[model samples]
Target: GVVEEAHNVKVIGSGEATIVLGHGFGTDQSVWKHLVPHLVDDYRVVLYDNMGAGTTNPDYFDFDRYSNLEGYSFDLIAILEDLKIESCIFVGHCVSAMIGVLASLNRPDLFSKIVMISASPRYVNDVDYQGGFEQEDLNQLFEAIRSNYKAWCLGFAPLAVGGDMDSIAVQEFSRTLFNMRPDIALSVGQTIFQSDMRQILPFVTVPCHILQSVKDLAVPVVVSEYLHANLGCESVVEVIPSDGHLPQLSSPDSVIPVILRHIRNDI
Candidate 1:
């Protein structure tokens, strides 16, 4: 089997309806574990590891090609082409949400709808836009990763889970976070925290559902509102009462239903 250049897919369920799930930064397809179980009986699922993050062919990852998020989006489009996947509903968490939008823009026919959880077009603060973090804050965060990568993950996994540091779930997530090579983790963080996709919003044509957590520290609520205002498609925005960036894991009972409701409508 030749290695895939862009996305790696794990298929589940036997239904004709397909759902493509993409993970966020510092995570692989495993992040979707909580959400996948609920959908297994009703929809065909495509779970993939993005390049530089999971079981992707590292040799296929060119630093030049992956320096920015658009390159990653290009890789996603390439994967859909390689898989012979036609129109599908794209479920993207965190960084992959924007990546999904970029891919949908390039080939709107490939995506019927986009479900963005904890998404933002930009993470750093810009003029008249409040992404909830100053540029220096993200810079320092990057420095933290560069300095003590292991310690950063040890601290960050719980922080990302809203300081439930002793929870079994947080410990499990920390293991995955710690498994990433320090340099790759740092580079991926830099790409996610630093990249911007404001210009691409208007190019999207698929229907979108922007799912925001009520107390997400990683992506601000205002950012979701901004996306709802800017996206060039029919969009619905809802805020769940979770406190973590990884709500699908921390609060699956709340998260899965919203996703399932959307999927059922299309089917």
Candidate 2:
């Protein structure tokens, strides 16, 4: 009960199969609103906010524990266990994708299939890997957050959603982003942007379905390709015909079918 309240867990729908939808950075469980309708008719849907999200109780976030990404993974496991979910499909976005991977690593039996949207094992360039961001870029991002969180949110929201600035998706993203505490935003952003989960890719046991948009500012197509090649278990990558990191929010119509395809066993 404590974990459920802490994560703001919501379980809805009418089917036997379970699907856990995890939100990304700068977002809460509300981001899944567009896709929930299509799912609830046929499957049980579980939605929850990550600790640093504005929707969650700020007091529940442990700075030291969350300093490592595994902290979020642990929270995920707790959420599933609390829900009595022995096996379910996990749909994670961006940072939450790695969170799901880590959770599956710790408890493989907890996940039947993992659907990663705009996922990347790393965000900064490595020796032979291109993670789409440079150290300078990340530093400037952290500075922008520290200097002026609100202004940064305004500028970043539209880009993350990848549509007209006046579009409802962009506005919704901005709304959720503006709800975040400045310090918490910066801390969570730094943790997500700086993390490198490449080393753990080969150890992952859950079958992963990578749903990458045709173009995403946060994750490059190569990251999905890398995941497909390196993940220890069976994996597939399908590029959604859309743009932006948050396709489920920005272009739900384009993404929903693909998501349903992956989440359904007898499609």
Candidate 3:
């Protein structure tokens, strides 16, 4: 497969240890703007716009290849290889949270630890799993995307960021939402919501921190519990007080401290 390249890549701060942050669907790397200010002094930060979402090389995005999470994982590994990044702490939000785990499982030596925020191994309700949504609901959501992507974004973006429709953060999130191609967004959403990584969790060996929001609409508390039980590493699960999926953006004061504590403990 041809590797997709990032167009907007930024390296902030300067340190031997790097912190690579990956954003979720419907948004870009700019989602980390709030948390970077605090970590920029102590860690080298790597941020890149994933292909098909941000200012990435559009020509490199092969829709056929990107129909699944592994495709995104491949792009992530390619970016790390291109940058010659050996090992680092990977902080991933939402869908990228699962993508990071997949990448780490494939190349365990490339990452030391992964901090997954608002992540879930599966999104659809299964036989014994409660993923917080039914298969029909996900299908309906996809249908909305196919019909009017912008309208779906307008409705979903604010829900993730946890704010009123007119809030500043919601406005900024809306801008990023508008940036995504409807088809690409639909593909990404289907891949994320349909993926079931429960069988693959035992393969991840790097230390993991699963950060759950107190009341996330997308990922339930049980999903985080499942990760803690299945991950093959020193795993820690912490639920901070937040109402939405993007806790780092909606409730950073509480989220940042927990993340910093985990980072410091690893050091």
> Pick by lDDT: which candidate is best?
2
How far residue 173's Cα lies from its native spot in candidate 1, in Å, is: 2.0
TM-score for candidate 3, residues paired by index: 0.94
Residues 1-267 of candidate 1: C-alpha lDDT, one tens digit per residue: 243634566777866677889888767888888888888888888888878874565567677787888887887787777768887889998999999998887888999999998998887887799888898998889899998988898878987876467986688678778777777788888888888898778778899999978898888898888898998898988888777888887778877787778666642
Model 3's C-alpha root-mean-square deviation from the true structure amounts to 2.2
Tens-digit lDDT string for candidate 2 (1-267): 888988889999876688899999998988888888888988899999999899887787789999989999999999888888888899998889999999999999999889998899899997899999999999999999999989999999989999788998899899999898889999999999999899999998889998889889988888889999999999988998899888988898889889888888521
Give one digit per residue, the lDDT tens place, for model 3 in 1-267: 233234477788988789999988777888887789988999999997777884565567788887778887887888888778899899988888888999988998999999988899998887899999998998899998898878888888777777466777788788887787777777778878888888989888899988888888899899999999998788999898766787777667777888777765762
Q: Which stretches of candidate 1 lie over 4 Å from their true place?
A: 4-8
Residue 218's C-alpha lDDT in candidate 2? 88
TM-score of each: 0.94, 0.97, 0.94
- For model 2, the stretches where C-alpha displacement exceeds 4 angstroms are none
Best by TM-score: 2
Tell me which of candidates 2 and 3 scores higher on TM-score: 2
Pairing residues by index, what is the TM-score of model 1? 0.94
User: For candidate 2, what is the lDDT?
Assistant: 0.90
